[PDB]
Design a protein around this ligand. Structure first.
Ligand SMILES: *SCCNC(=O)CCNC(=O)[C@H](O)C(C)(C)COP(=O)(O)OP(=O)(O)OC[C@H]1O[C@@H](n2cnc3c(N)ncnc32)[C@H](O)[C@@H]1OP(=O)(O)O
Ligand SMILES: *SCCNC(=O)CCNC(=O)[C@H](O)C(C)(C)COP(=O)(O)OP(=O)(O)OC[C@H]1O[C@@H](n2cnc3c(N)ncnc32)[C@H](O)[C@@H]1OP(=O)(O)O
Lengths: 165, 164
């Protein structure tokens, strides 16, 4: 039904190099029925997420400002969501009330990999976050993904700490 | 106008800190208590005047999850001398879980090595656990390992960044 953010803000950022069966768009409320939770399960554990919790969380995200820019790719051949990536923006006071962007939950369906859907999403989100005015954008991942992330500007960084246990 | 609720902060503030220090949420009038001069000791604050401060503070105060910005005010100067933020990212993964990030940690240069930084980290790790976050992280510099290792944190280089 509804989109998690306005598809008009995303439109200028979507590249043009994907086959016509791919549609890049905001997550939508009825993407549960399009396999979104199955997609997330390929990334990590979804725990007890079910459709009611998915819809409630989707509403909470949809009313947030800055928006949760959760961008998906729907394969029109199957009408399933086959890729997802999130650009989440934290408001700051530093840098003149600037914004700090993070690219999270990046996943492409395992059968659909090496068709460029991953690069399309990271390119779209990097362009969206620059346009939004973010001063710093980051990705938490293993950069075995070296070739991949660097061509969009990301550099290895170790100014990040997690808990030991 | 407080950025988040003092009653939520209360159980996580450690005991018997010296009495010239008050640990509390960031307040809209903290601009007049030297908040910008404190943040400058962390990085460029740009042209953050009172009007822009207040516009941004209100945008953050109405966001859910809240921006858990905790500051320490010193009596002996009536100035904000320390600040740290716990910012919470909603997820769908982990049962519509939530991810906590400790950010913008800074103690005024004249007030360092009096445990203010430690109080802020203990407070925010305890508050993040209460909020039910499944993972918490810190962004800091590796040179400061002898500080952050005291609150469970260790360096994690599965991270990439760029400045625009
Ligand atoms: S932690 C953040 C990343 N998310 C995950 O790691 C979750 C699981 N992995 C994925 O969902 C996908 O494997 C990701 C990493 C999102 C990649 O998506 P795509 O497969 O759609 O990537 P592209 O087709 O756009 O790939 C472009 C370039 O990526 C490099 N590359 C991808 N995968 C590999 C592997 N497996 N081994 C070596 N290199 C890989 C290549 O430079 C690739 O260009 P090619 O023309 O495909 O060689
Ligand atoms: S996450 C940090 C990113 N922020 C900054 O880099 C901003 C500039 N730095 C600061 O604001 C302060 O130096 C920080 C890093 C916030 C620490 O604040 P405090 O000065 O209040 O620290 P504590 O008194 O709580 O220190 C507790 C123990 O941590 C170690 N420690 C603090 N500072 C250092 C330095 N610079 N180098 C090595 N260790 C440091 C000490 O073990 C300290 O215990 P002592 O009992 O003082 O030795």
């Amino acid at each position: 039904m509804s989109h998690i953010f306005d598809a008009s803000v995303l439109a200028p950022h979507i590249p043009s190099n994907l086959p016509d069966n791919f549609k890049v768009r905001p997550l939508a409320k009825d993407d549960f029925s399009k396999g979104y939770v199955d997609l997330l399960s390929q990334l990590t554990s979804v725990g007890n997420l079910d459709q009611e919790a998915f819809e409630k969380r989707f509403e909470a995200m949809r009313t947030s400002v800055p928006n949760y820019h959760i961008v998906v790719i729907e394969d029109s051949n199957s009408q399933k969501v086959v890729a997802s990536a999130s650009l989440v923006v934290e408001m700051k006071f530093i840098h003149g009330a600037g914004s700090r962007g993070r690219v999270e939950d990046v996943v492409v369906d395992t059968e659909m990999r090496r068709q460029k859907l991953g690069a399309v999403l990271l390119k779209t989100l990097v362009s969206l976050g620059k346009s939004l005015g973010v001063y710093k954008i980051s990705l938490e991942c293993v950069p075995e993904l070296l070739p991949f992330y660097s061509q969009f500007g990301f550099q290895d960084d170790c100014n990040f700490m997690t808990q030991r246990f």
